[PDB]
Design a protein around this ligand. Structure first.
Ligand code: HEB
Ligand code: HEB
Ligand code: NA
Ligand code: NA
Ligand code: NA
Ligand code: NA
Ligand code: NA
Ligand code: NA
Lengths: 710, 710
C-alpha cells in the first residue's frame, strides 16, 4: 500500500481524453535508450560477419527445439510468417507500421491475435541475436529471417539490406484504429468502415488486430469475391498492386501451413497479458498439448501445398486444378478443402511423415481463383513460374524494405544495384562550388525573405520519419505532382524556381542545394534585421531527381493538405488543426520545444500560405523576433472565436481587433505544456535563445533526409 | 483524416491496463526540456536580484488587473491560497506532491476543483516571471508569492529559500487516488476509505480533487466534530501536528475570503477542458459576471475577518466570541454565519467599501472551536497572539519547504540559519584523508563482498527524489530507528558497523564515507574476481548526523518494508512486487535500464535479504557477471509457479529444479520492454558494458543525496 502511479491506467488521460498527445514527440529519448550516446548502429552492422550469420540462420531453420518444435523439422514456414507479419503492418498514407523498427517485439503488435505464436518465432531467433550482439539489430534479424527461410527452401531471393535501428518501447505515435476490442465485426460501434463499406482512410487492415484481411471471409462469412475486394483495398494501402498481391499470396502459401488442431479456448492470454511464468511468451496451452500437430494458431488447419517445406509450383496446381468447398477446421474455422484429392497430394503430418493430413485454402486464396483479375494473373503464374518467382522475389523485397528510405541507408553485401523506383532515388550532387557565391547570388536576386523561406520549408516538409520518404533532397518540389500542389502555392513556387534554377545552372550546385541555401539566406537576413549575425550551418551534396525516377502516384500520399507551420488547411477535416499539426511534427521527427520555436519564427517571417495575417503578432514582419510569444502571452488581449479555425485578438481596453489567429496559433497559449514553452520564449532574457533555437530547428528539418552524409 | 495517435486516449494502456508503467522512469528527459544541456538553475538563481523581486512582487499585490480584479485592491488573500494549495499537495508517506516542482501549472493539478481560479493567480504572476526570466523558476515564484503576500499584509514571515527547478510536464508518477470522478462522496465505488472510515494509506486528501478536507463537512454534511477528525488525519499525513494545524488554519483565514456569489453551473470547463479561446484559463463565466463580487470559486461566500486585507487577531475574535449557525451561500453551499454580528465587524464589499457583506466560517473553522484539543490551542492563540504569529510563520515556512530537502539546496538571502529538524540536517564531513588507506583497511577486514554491498545499499536506498529525504549522507543507518529496521538486517548491520566505525575513528573519515567506500570495495573486489580492474569514482564529504537531529518518528515513512533490489518483502501487500519495485526505483531517480543492471548485479553479488538464493542465477556468487541475464533469458529452462512470489526454474530435459526466483526476478524476463534490456545484457558481446553500466548505476545511487557538492 503505496503512492506510485505504478500501472498504466493511472494517468491524466482519463480526465481529459481529448487532450493533445504531446508524448509522441518525446519517444525514444536518452533514458529509455540503454546504449551509450556514441553508439552508432550503422558503423557496427558494417563490421558484421554476414556470411557467418547466413550460415547460422539457415541451420536454425532445421534446428527444431522441443518447447515449440518445427513443422516437419523446418521452421521456414513460421519464419516467413514472422517477417511477412512484421512488414505487413506498413500503410502508405503516413508510412507508419513496417518492419523497419523491429516493433513486433513490444506491445501492442506482439499480442495482436494475427501474431499468435510469432512470439515463438522471435524467441527462436534469440540465440543468433545473442551471438552477433550489437552488430545485429532485432529489427534486421526479424526482417532477414524469412528471406533466409526462402533461400533455404529453394527461392532465389532478390536481396537484402541491413540498417534498421532497434527501438526500446512501442511506437506510441501509431494510431491502429478506433476499436476497443479485438477483431470485432465491422457492424459494431467504433467501426472503421463508413459509407458503402469504405475503409477509414489511414487504416490498412479490416479490423483491429489483423494484418490485412479476415481469412474466414468478410466478418467471418466466406465469400471469395467479397474477400477479393478487401485484399485489393488493403494491399493497395500497403503499396502493392494486383500483380504483386497475387504473387505475395501464392508465394507465401507455397510453403508452410495453417494450425488449428485443438480448442482455441484452451489457449492462455496473449503475451502482454500472460503471467511472468510464461517467459514473455503467450497463447500457451497448459490444459493440453499446444505444440507440434496440436498447435492452434489461426485455427484453420491444413497446408496449401503437398510439399510445404519447399518452393515448388504446388500452390496453383492445387488451387486451379482441384475444385474446393467449405468445411470446418477442428477448432471451428471456415476453410476450403479440395474435393477428391489424391493421396500423393496430401501434406503429411508435422511429427510423423507416415500420416497424411489435409489441404486447405483460405477465403483469400479462393479469391485468387474467383476474382476475375486475380484469376488471369494466377493463370499467368501457373503457366510461367519463372515469372512468378521473379515477380514474387521482387515484391518480397519491396515488402520488407518499403519503409527503409533512400538507398544511402542500405548496408550489406546483398543489396541490389538496381535503383527501384519505390526507393525514391536521388543522385549524389556536386559538393565543390563556392557556397558564399550562391548566397550572394540568392541575396542579389529580387526575392523576399518570405519567398525564400516558404519555398525551402515546402521542399523539406514532405519528410516523414515513418518510412523515410520526402524531404528537400532530390528537389522533387520542382517536379510533378509537387510543383502543382495547392499547398505549395505553384505561382510563387514557379516564380522562385525560375530564379533558383538559374543560380544552380551558373554555379553547378543542385537546385536542391540552392533551394535550401536560399531558405538559409532569408533566415540570415531576418536575423540580421533584428541585429543578430548568424551563419546557419549548411551541408552540400543534394541531388536533383529525374521525373523518370519519380513515381507520380506514390507521392500523392505526401501532399501537404494541411500544414500548421504555414497556417495551411486545404479543407475542413474531422481532426482539429492542432492534432494535424502534431501528426506532421511527429513525422518530421520534431520535439515539442522545436515545434514551438518554428511556429513562432515562421509566423513573424510572414510565411502563411495565402499571405494571410493569422498569427503574425508583430509590427515587423520579416524580422526574426520572439514577438509571436510576447504578444500571445499578454493578457492585455482577450481572444474571441470568429468562426471556423479563426479568432480575433482584441484589446481589452478599446475592445478593438488587433490581430487574427487560428487554432494552430492559439493552442500554443492554451495547452498548459505549450504555453509553458511559449512563456519561456517570451521572457525578457530569451531573445537570443529563441533565435539560436529556431535556427537549430530549421536546420534539423533541412537536414532530416540527408542519409547520404551520416 | 490521418494516422497519428494524436489524442491521449489512443494508447496501449486500454488493452493491458494492469501493465507496469515504465514511463514514470523516463520523465523529464532531454526532449521535453527546452533548456540547454548546460543550463544550471542553481547558479542562475544565485545571481537574481531578490531585493528587486520583493519590491515587484509586493507592488503586484495591489496592482489590480481588470480581467480578474483584486478583492479590495489586495491580491494577497488569493496569492496565499495559491501557495497554500501548491504546497498542500505534499504527503509524507512517499514525499510526493509539494510546491517543490511548480506542478500546479500543468495537469491534473491546474484543473482540480479545489484549485478553482488559481489559474488566475498564476497568470497574474506572469509579468514578474517574464521580467526575471531564467533566474526565477515558476516553482520558486509560485512558492514565494504567498510569503510576500504575508509580509505585505503585516506578518513577520520566518524566511524563504529559492532552488526549485521547474519541470515541463505533469509528474506522471504521482498516484492521486482510485476515483474516476471529481469530489465524489466516500460512499461510492472506487472509494479511498476502507474499514472504520480509515483513509487509503498513501493518500492525504478526503477525496479526488481536494487538497485536504471538505469545507462543507464530511461528504458535504456539516458536523464540525467529524470534520475535526478528517483535518487531524489529513494534516498529519502532510506532517503537521495539532498545534501547527490550528495555526495554519487560523493564519490562512485571518486574511482573504470565500467566493460564491453566483451560480456555479454557469462556470465553464476547468482549464484542461476549456477551449483555446480561454487563454489556458478556466472556470470562466461567459453568461454573467464571474469577477469581483460576482466571483464563484469554492461557492461559500463571506470573509472570516472584518479586515481581510490584514494580519490582525480577527479570526479568533470572530470564531470564539460570536455564536454561529448553518446557512446557505448564494451558490448553495453550507457555511456558518455568526448570530447578531455588529455592523462594524462586517467585511465590506470587494468593489465598493460603503457596502457591508457577511462573515463566514467553514466546517473546518468550526472544528477549531468544537474539537476539544483544537479548542485549547485556539484559546492559547487567542490569549497569546505573539505565540500564534510565531507558530504560524514557522509552519508556513515548513509548509512551503517541507519537500526541498537538505539545507545545501536552499539559496538566497532570507534563509533561516536555524537547522530545523525536519530539514534532516547533516554536518559537512572531513574531506582530507587518504582514500586508498580506507580502502586497504576495509579490504584488510574480514568482511565479505556481500556484507559490504548490502550495508552500503541499505544506507542509500532510503533516498527519495520526491522530497529529497534519505540517502547515505549522514549515516542515519547507524541510528534509531534505522539500525533496528528488519529490512536492514540489524545483526549483520551491527556486525559491519562495529568494523567500519573503527576504520572511520582511525582515519577521520565519516562513518558515512566509510560505508559507501566499503560498498565500492566489495564491488571492485567482485569485478576483480571476474578479471575486470575498475576504480569506482568516489566523493568524500558526508557527515554523520546526531540522534538529536534525527526525528525518529518522521523516519518511519522511509522504512524499507519492501525492496526488490534485495528481494525483500516484509509482508504480502496488495500491490504486486514488481509495482513495488517500480515505485522505489522511481523514487531513487533511476531509469529502467539502470533498474535492470542493478538487479542483475546485486543478484550475482549475493545480496538478498536473508541470504536467500532467489534470482541468483550463477555458479559464482560474489563475482560480477552478466549471468543473471544470461540464465534468465535461456529457453533450456521453463518456469513454474511455486506459491507466493516464488517460482522454480526447471530444466526442460531433466525436469529438475535448477534455481528459484521471485516475481521481482522474473518480471525482467516477462515484460517485453524489460526482457529487451535483459536480452541486450545477455549478449556475448556485453559483459564489459554490463559492468561499466552496473557501476555507473551503483554510483548514481551512492551520490543521489550529495547536494552539498553540486
Ligand atoms: C509473402 C508471404 C505471405 C502473404 C502475402 C500472406 C498473406 C495472407 N495470409 Fe498467410 N502465411 C504465410 C505467408 C503469407 N501469407 C506463411 C509462410 C504461413 C505459414 C505459417 C507456418 O507455416 O507456420 C502463412 C499462414 C497463414 C495462416 C495460418 C496461420 C496459422 O498458423 O494458423 C492464415 C489464416 C493466413 C492468411 C493470409 C491471408 C488472409 C493473407 C492475405 C492474402 N496465412
Ligand atoms: C495557511 C493558509 C491556509 C490553510 C491551512 C487553509 C486551510 C483550509 N482552507 Fe483556506 N484559504 C486561505 C488559506 C488557508 N486555508 C486563504 C488565504 C484563502 C483566501 C482566498 C482569497 O481570499 O481569494 C482561503 C480560502 C478558502 C476557501 C474559499 C475559497 C474561495 O475563494 O471560495 C475555502 C472553502 C477554504 C477551506 C479551507 C479548509 C477546509 C482548510 C483545512 C483547514 N479556504
Ligand atoms: Na513505418
Ligand atoms: Na510447396
Ligand atoms: Na505426398
Ligand atoms: Na514532493
Ligand atoms: Na484580518
Ligand atoms: Na468595519
Amino acid at each position: 500500500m503505496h503512492g506510485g502511479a505504478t500501472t498504466v491506467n493511472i494517468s491524466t488521460a482519463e480526465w481529459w481524453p481529448k487532450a493533445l498527445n504531446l508524448d509522441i514527440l518525446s519517444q525514444h529519448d536518452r533514458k529509455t535508450n540503454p546504449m551509450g550516446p556514441d553508439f552508432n548502429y550503422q558503423e557496427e552492422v558494417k563490421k558484421l560477419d554476414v556470411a557467418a550469420l547466413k550460415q547460422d540462420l539457415q541451420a536454425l531453420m532445421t534446428d527444431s527445439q522441443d518447447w515449440f518444435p518445427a513443422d516437419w523439422g523446418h521452421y521456414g514456414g513460421l519464419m516467413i510468417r514472422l517477417t511477412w507479419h512484421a512488414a505487413g503492418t506498413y500503410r502508405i498514407a503516413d508510412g507508419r507500421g513496417g518492419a523497419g523498427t523491429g516493433n513486433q517485439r513490444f506491445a501492442p503488435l506482439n499480442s495482436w491475435p494475427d501474431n499468435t505464436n510469432l512470439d515463438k518465432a522471435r524467441r527462436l531467433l534469440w540465440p543468433i541475436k545473442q551471438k552477433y550482439g550489437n552488430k545485429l539489430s532485432w529489427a534486421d534479424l526479424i526482417a532477414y529471417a524469412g528471406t533466409i527461410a526462402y533461400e533455404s527452401m529453394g527461392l532465389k531471393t532478390f536481396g537484402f539490406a541491413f540498417g534498421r535501428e532497434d527501438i526500446w518501447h512501442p511506437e506510441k505515435d501509431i494510431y491502429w484504429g478506433p476499436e476497443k476490442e479485438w477483431v470485432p465485426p465491422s457492424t459494431n460501434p467504433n467501426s472503421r468502415y463508413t459509407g458503402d463499406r469504405e475503409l477509414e482512410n489511414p487504416l490498412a487492415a479490416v479490423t483491429m488486430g489483423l494484418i490485412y484481411v479476415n481469412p474466414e471471409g468478410v466478418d467471418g462469412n466466406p465469400d471469395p469475391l467479397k474477400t477479393a475486394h478487401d485484399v485489393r483495398v488493403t494491399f493497395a494501402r500497403m503499396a502493392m498492386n494486383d500483380e504483386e498481391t497475387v504473387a505475395l499470396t501464392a508465394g507465401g502459401h507455397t510453403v508452410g501451413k495453417c494450425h488449428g488442431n485443438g480448442n482455441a479456448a484452451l489457449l492462455g492470454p496473449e503475451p502482454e497479458g500472460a503471467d511472468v511464468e510464461d517467459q514473455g511468451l503467450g497463447w500457451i496451452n497448459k490444459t493440453q498439448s499446444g505444440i507440434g500437430r496440436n498447435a492452434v494458431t489461426s485455427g484453420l488447419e491444413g497446408a496449401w501445398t503437398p510439399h510445404p517445406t519447399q518452393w515448388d509450383n504446388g500452390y496453383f496446381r492445387m488451387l486451379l486444378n482441384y475444385d474446393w468447398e467449405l468445411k470446418k477446421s477442428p477448432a471451428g474455422a471456415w476453410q476450403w478443402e479440395p474435393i477428391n484429392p489424391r493421396e500423393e497430394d496430401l501434406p503429411v503430418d508435422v511429427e510423423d511423415p507416415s500420416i497424411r493430413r489435409n489441404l486447405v485454402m483460405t477465403d483469400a486464396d479462393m479469391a485468387m481463383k474467383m476474382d476475375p483479375e486475380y484469376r488471369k494473373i494466377s493463370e499467368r503464374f501457373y503457366q510461367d513460374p519463372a515469372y512468378f518467382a521473379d515477380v514474387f522475389a521482387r515484391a518480397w523485397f519491396k515488402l520488407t524494405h518499403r519503409d527503409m528510405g533512400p538507398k544511402a541507408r542500405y548496408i550489406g553485401p546483398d543489396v541490389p544495384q538496381e535503383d527501384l523506383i519505390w526507393q525514391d532515388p536521388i543522385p549524389a550532387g556536386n559538393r565543390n562550388y563556392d557556397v558564399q557565391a550562391v548566397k550572394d547570388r540568392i541575396a542579389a536576386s529580387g526575392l523576399s525573405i518570405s519567398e525564400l523561406v516558404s519555398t525551402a520549408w515546402d521542399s523539406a516538409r514532405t519528410y516523414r520519419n515513418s518510412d523515410k520518404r520526402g524531404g528537400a533532397n532530390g528537389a522533387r518540389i520542382r517536379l510533378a505532382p509537387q510543383k502543382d500542389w495547392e499547398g505549395n502555392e505553384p505561382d510563387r513556387l514557379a516564380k522562385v524556381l525560375a530564379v533558383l534554377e538559374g543560380i544552380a545552372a551558373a554555379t553547378g550546385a543542385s537546385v536542391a542545394d540552392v533551394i535550401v541555401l536560399a531558405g538559409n539566406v532569408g533566415v540570415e537576413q531576418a536575423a540580421r534585421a533584428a541585429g543578430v549575425e548568424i551563419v546557419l550551418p549548411f551541408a552540400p551534396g543534394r541531388g536533383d531527381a529525374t521525373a523518370e525516377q519519380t513515381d507520380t502516384e506514390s507521392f500523392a500520399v505526401l501532399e501537404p493538405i494541411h500544414d500548421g507551420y504555414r497556417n495551411w488547411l486545404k479543407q475542413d477535416y474531422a481532426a482539429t488543426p492542432e492534432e494535424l499539426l502534431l501528426d506532421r511534427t511527429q513525422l518530421l521527427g520534431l520535439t515539442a520545444p522545436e515545434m514551438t520555436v518554428l511556429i513562432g519564427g515562421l509566423r513573424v517571417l510572414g510565411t502563411n500560405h495565402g499571405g494571410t495575417k493569422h498569427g503574425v503578432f508583430t509590427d515587423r514582419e520579416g524580422v526574426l523576433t520572439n514577438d509571436f510569444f510576447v504578444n500571445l502571452t499578454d493578457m492585455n488581449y482577450l481572444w474571441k472565436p470568429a468562426g471556423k479555425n479563426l479568432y480575433e485578438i482584441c484589446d481589452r481596453k478599446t475592445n478593438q481587433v488587433k490581430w487574427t489567429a487560428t487554432r494552430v496559433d492559439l493552442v500554443f497559449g492554451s495547452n498548459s505544456i505549450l504555453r509553458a514553452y511559449s512563456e519561456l520564449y517570451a521572457q525578457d532574457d530569451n531573445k537570443e535563445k529563441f533565435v539560436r533555437d529556431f535556427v537549430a530547428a530549421w536546420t534539423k528539418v533541412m537536414n532530416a533526409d540527408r542519409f547520404d552524409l551520416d
